[PDB]
Design a protein around this nucleic acid. Structure first.
Ligand code: CO
Lengths: 122, 153, 129, 371, 69, 116
RNA sequence: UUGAAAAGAACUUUGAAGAGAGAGUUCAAGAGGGCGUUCAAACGAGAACUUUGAAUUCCAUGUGAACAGCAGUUGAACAUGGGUCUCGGGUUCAGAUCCCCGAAUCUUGGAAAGCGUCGCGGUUCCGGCGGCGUAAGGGCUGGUAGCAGCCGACUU
RNA sequence: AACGCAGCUAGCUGCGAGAAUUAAUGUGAAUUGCAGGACACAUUGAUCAUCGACACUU
């Protein structure tokens, strides 16, 4: 009687297609009743059917993306959509590795002259 | 009580104007019910709507005047308002004369009443306005032929 | 006095926030005192009103000691309708009269699993102190 | 000997009463409240009695229709049982009435389609073709049906119950109907009748499922006045206070209807229409279409101004008529009456009787031992 | 439209698969046979009644015959 | 060289062999049969076209064409179609006139849909 | 910017209505929804002006607050519905070289269609069946100064 | 910038053919002009807030 997303998450791909097909046919019949004389009960069903269609399509679209996420887990090149978004300026800045590199000359100075902790008595 | 619609459909169905449609004065309630072309066709067949006859414009008076003017009754000197050339173009009068007098000359040639050599001379004289009518021309031809006959005898 | 830097005492800001509140916030504002006998039993001064609770009116024209059941909670107008608080329209029809929840006393309470949990939470706060 | 009716009713009423004089109704004196005096001269022979005599022929038709209605309802009461589909019940009742009345075109027949309404539904519901609704034990049914002889109509309805729990509600509605019938009288304001009915009805309480409801009238619904070939003659009898002050008159026929609801007390339209009637005021409107004019012909040649339903049209053999009917309703020739329903989960009850106000007395023609 | 001139040619055209029907018209001075093919309508004019009646009997089997008159 | 002009020589051009697909999955088709036909029409001028010249009147999507309309009506109702005529209404809607094949009859089909 | 709260004036009575007189709610209405050219007829409550006879504005139905510099039973006003799919005949309240039928890219088409008239059934249903009809200016043909015949408008 | 989307809906506001909203998490019996429809409320939930998954006409 009530379509809940939790029930439909683990169902098979073909089974979802049939449920989508049946719901679409119900909506078309209800539209015919609107143009002719229509019962108050019949008109109110239109909003329930419309939300049920959106709910099933969400499950179908959501499931297919995680299938593609796993396939490209280790590949060097990924589709543009599967990459992170953030901000355009953020995608142009240097990564964590590059930012903290140092030249051989700087490394020697750090080892030879480390900073100290001291107190002046007074 | 208003019959604007029923006087417009009838004119279209009867292929006439709205000044030639007669609607029954005493049958207004029945006519009012009609609202489609199919119903208007029914009432025309039943006598309720009729097409009036055309007004009369007779030509009898002008036909009589034409017969009088054929004998010249109303021509006169005080009834003419345009120039003589306007009434009849002189170019048309000349053109008619040339065709009448050139057709006659050709026919005489086939019947061997004239020779070609005399024919050429007469043709140029006709172009020079020597002759005015068929009678004036034929008389000249007869006079010419007689002179030739006498000279031989 | 109030010492918090990030709280306002302005007249115009408080009035605006009260009149334009989301529905979940309006549940907290519409609360009513609990009766003396119930107060000792649960150690809870007040509770938010609900659709099916017995009530008594303590102020206004309809003041009395009769007990009625709540029939509808109208949050848009901040009013509730009770069983027998009613007057007659000109035609002869009967209409309910709105009562603000702060002017009523709860005599009996609806009991559900979630409501029992809110009651328990309030009891611990007082004892800790 | 005098023709005796068979176990399944089949003899026509006229055969059972060859002479012409049909059984009479319940006769009672008019309400004694006449601004401080009584007209006990109405019971004695006078010019009132002379006028009354002049209408004996009319009264006979009403008595005949009442006899047929009583016999039909007695038959229906015996075999009604849970689990049957409503279409079968309607067909059986209609066939039995068609046989007992001995319909002859517009001379005799059924005034309006039989209406069986369940639970929240209060009126104007009959199962169309293709409906699969089965009676249940926890259900209330209202059966309303009528018959007519030469344009004299009788409209009566009762309520049938199975589960004992609805006893108090049925008793309250019946008491209100009886009080309303008692109050009715010649030259009496309708508003006073409505006030009496409301005061009597409001003093009742019911307990179903353990929740305590109050029996209250349905303000929208009301009674009506009956005329020859016209089921509504233009007067309405309210069941509540606050209404017009029209007065009753002698020689008039009225239907006293009481509806009770354990809910809000207002009715709206919820389901598909099934009852249609032709408008008595309207005249000639240009139809402008082939098939709807066949429809209007059939209507004018079988039903006249009496109400019809789609099952009857199907039985006559007509098909694909929905658009023609809708066009007719749009033009204003025919009027659709849709079902009326209360809030979901409510319960209703309806008792109705038809009374004739005679010059000399008050006769409840529909009255019988059953109710 | 086209006009056939000889009787035999009318038989050969009628046999054609495209031919759909034959209509006969009976005027006061003549009898006309018209066959409806895919692209054209073919007419044979017979001026004498006696020959036409013989011709009608031997029309190709299966072509629907419609008598307009 | 037999000509006084120098023209650019022809060189080998290669086809694309991308290393990743720029878009993960193809976009779903959002103009299916159910979307093509919004509803049927029941006015007073549509009831004269069913009982006389065997036609049905529909309201359809604005972006459809005569070829798409014929396939959609065929599949949904299992019927044959001969011609489609379309106009865009003054209020911005599209109305299509469809003519049924001789074997089929509009009246029974319309009754099945619920129109009549 | 009515009132604490619509409790936003049931019912009776005059008028076609707009408007009033009584009642009713409220602490308060001294708070009442921007409030602290001529003659006849018909229809109509009503005619110098509407209709009939005689001398998106498109198309139906409904109305008469406002508007149409007088009126209005009327409107391009106000409200609710509808309408735009290489030739000849049909068809709508409003669309047709676009819909339907038929042909295509002197004779076949062609009389079966169209148009006149005279009839027979029918009454919101038959969109149904027949009878008839369509003084002087010039031509032509047949043959001594030519003639036989018919013709033929205009001009001076 | 344009055009669309509500049972009754012109504007403002919200959204994009999944179109006055889908999923997820908090909360815990309403929304309301009228009707209809829901909802053990944990064999898991009306409504609002938040928002990280999905979708996004020209
Ligand atoms: Co009744």
């Amino acid at each position: 009687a009530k379509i809940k997303a939790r029930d439909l998450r683990g169902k098979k791909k073909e089974e979802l297609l049939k449920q989508l097909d049946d719901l679409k046919v119900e909506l078309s019949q209800l539209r015919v009743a609107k143009v002719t004389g229509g019962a108050a009960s019949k008109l109110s069903k239109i909003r329930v059917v419309r939300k049920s269609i959106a709910r099933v399509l969400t499950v179908i679209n959501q499931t297919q993306k995680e299938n593609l996420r796993k396939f490209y887990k280790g590949k060097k090149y990924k589709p543009l959509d599967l990459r992170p978004k953030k901000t355009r300026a953020m995608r142009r800045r240097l990564n964590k590795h590059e930012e903290n590199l140092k030249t051989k000359k700087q490394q020697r100075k750090e080892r030879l002259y480390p900073l100290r902790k001291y107190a002046v008595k007074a | 009580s208003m019959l604007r619609l029923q006087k417009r459909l009838a004119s279209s169905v009867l292929r006439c104007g709205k000044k030639k449609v007669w609607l029954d004065p005493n049958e207004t309630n029945e006519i009012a019910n009609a609202n489609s072309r199919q119903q208007i066709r029914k009432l025309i067949k039943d006598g309720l709507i009729i097409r009036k006859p055309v007004t009369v414009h007779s030509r009898a008076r002008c036909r009589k005047n034409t017969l009088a003017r054929r004998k010249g009754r109303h021509m006169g000197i005080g009834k003419r308002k345009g120039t003589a050339n306007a009434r009849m173009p002189e170019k048309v009068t000349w053109m008619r004369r040339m065709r009448i007098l050139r057709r006659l000359l050709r026919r005489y040639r086939e019947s061997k009443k004239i020779d070609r050599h005399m024919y050429h001379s007469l043709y140029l004289k006709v172009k020079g306005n020597v002759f005015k009518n068929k009678r004036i021309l034929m008389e000249h031809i007869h006079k010419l032929k007689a002179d030739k006959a006498r000279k031989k005898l | 006095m109030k010492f918090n830097p990030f709280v306002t005492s302005d007249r115009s800001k408080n009035r605006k926030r009260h009149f334009n509140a989301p529905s979940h916030i309006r549940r907290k504002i519409m609360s009513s005192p609990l009766s003396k006998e119930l107060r000792q039993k649960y150690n809870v001064r007040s509770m938010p009103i609900r659709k099916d609770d017995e009530v008594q009116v303590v102020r206004g024209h309809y003041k009395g000691q009769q007990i009625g059941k709540v029939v509808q909670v109208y949050r848009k107008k901040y009013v509730i309708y009770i069983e027998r608080v009613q007057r007659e329209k000109a035609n002869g029809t009967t209409v309910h009269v709105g009562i603000h929840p702060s002017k009523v006393v709860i005599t009996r309470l609806k009991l559900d699993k979630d409501r029992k949990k809110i009651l328990e939470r309030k009891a611990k706060s007082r004892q800790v102190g | 000997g005098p023709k005796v009716q068979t176990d399944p009713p089949s003899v026509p009423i006229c055969d059972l009463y060859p002479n012409g004089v049909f059984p009479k109704g319940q006769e009672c004196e008019y309400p004694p409240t006449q601004d401080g005096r009584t007209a006990a001269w109405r019971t004695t022979s006078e010019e009132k009695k002379a006028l009354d005599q002049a209408s004996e022929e009319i009264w006979n038709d009403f008595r005949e229709a009442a006899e047929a209605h009583r016999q039909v309802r007695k038959y229906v009461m015996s075999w009604i049982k849970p689990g049957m589909t409503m279409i079968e019940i309607c067909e059986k009742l209609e066939d039995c009435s068609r046989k007992l009345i001995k319909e002859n075109g517009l001379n005799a027949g059924l005034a309006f389609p039989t209406g069986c309404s369940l639970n929240n539904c209060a009126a104007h519901y009959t199962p169309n073709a293709g409906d699969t609704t089965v009676l249940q034990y926890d259900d209330i049914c209202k059966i309303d049906f009528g018959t007519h002889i030469s344009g004299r109509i009788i409209d009566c309805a009762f309520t049938v119950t199975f589960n004992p729990k609805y006893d108090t509600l049925l008793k309250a509605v019946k008491d209100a109907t009886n009080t309303g019938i008692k109050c009715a009288g010649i030259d009496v304001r309708l508003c006073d009748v409505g006030e009496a009915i409301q005061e009597v009805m409001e003093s009742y309480e019911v307990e179903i499922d353990g929740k305590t409801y109050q029996v209250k009238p349905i303000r929208n619904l009301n009674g009506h006045s009956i005329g020859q070939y016209r089921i509504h003659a233009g007067k309405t009898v309210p069941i509540v206070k606050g209404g017009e002050a029209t007065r009753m008159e002698e020689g008039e026929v009225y239907a006293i209807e009481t509806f009770g609801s354990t809910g809000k007390g207002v009715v709206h339209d919820d389901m598909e229409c099934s009852h249609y009637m032709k408008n008595f005021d309207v005249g000639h409107v240009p139809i402008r279409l082939p098939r709807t004019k066949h429809l209007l012909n059939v209507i004018n040649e079988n039903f006249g101004t009496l109400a019809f339903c789609r099952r009857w049209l199907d039985r006559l053999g007509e098909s694909k008529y929905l658009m023609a009917l809708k066009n007719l309703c749009d033009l204003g020739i025919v009027d659709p009456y849709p079902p009326l329903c209360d809030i979901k989960g409510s319960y209703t009850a309806q008792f109705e009787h038809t009374i004739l106000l005679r010059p000399t007395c008050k006769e409840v023609v529909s009255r019988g031992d059953d109710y | 439209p086209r006009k056939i001139e000889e009787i035999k040619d009318f038989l050969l055209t009628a046999r054609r698969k495209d031919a759909k029907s034959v209509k006969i018209k009976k005027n006061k001075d003549n009898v006309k046979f018209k066959v409806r093919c895919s692209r054209y309508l073919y007419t044979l004019v017979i001026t004498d009644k006696e020959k036409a009646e013989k011709l009608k009997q031997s029309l190709p089997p299966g072509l629907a015959v419609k008598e307009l008159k | 060289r037999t000509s006084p002009t120098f023209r650019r020589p022809k060189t080998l051009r290669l086809r694309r062999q991308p290393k990743y697909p720029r878009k993960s999955a193809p976009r779903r088709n959002k103009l299916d049969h159910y979307a093509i036909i919004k509803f049927p029409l029941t006015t007073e001028s549509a009831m004269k076209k069913i009982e006389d010249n065997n036609t049905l009147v529909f309201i359809v999507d604005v972006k459809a064409n005569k070829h798409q309309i014929k396939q959609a009506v065929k599949k949904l109702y299992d019927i044959d179609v001969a011609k489609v005529n379309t106009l865009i209404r003054p209020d911005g809607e599209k109305k299509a006139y469809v003519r049924l094949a001789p074997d089929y009859d509009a009246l029974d089909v319309a009754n099945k849909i619920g129109i009549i």
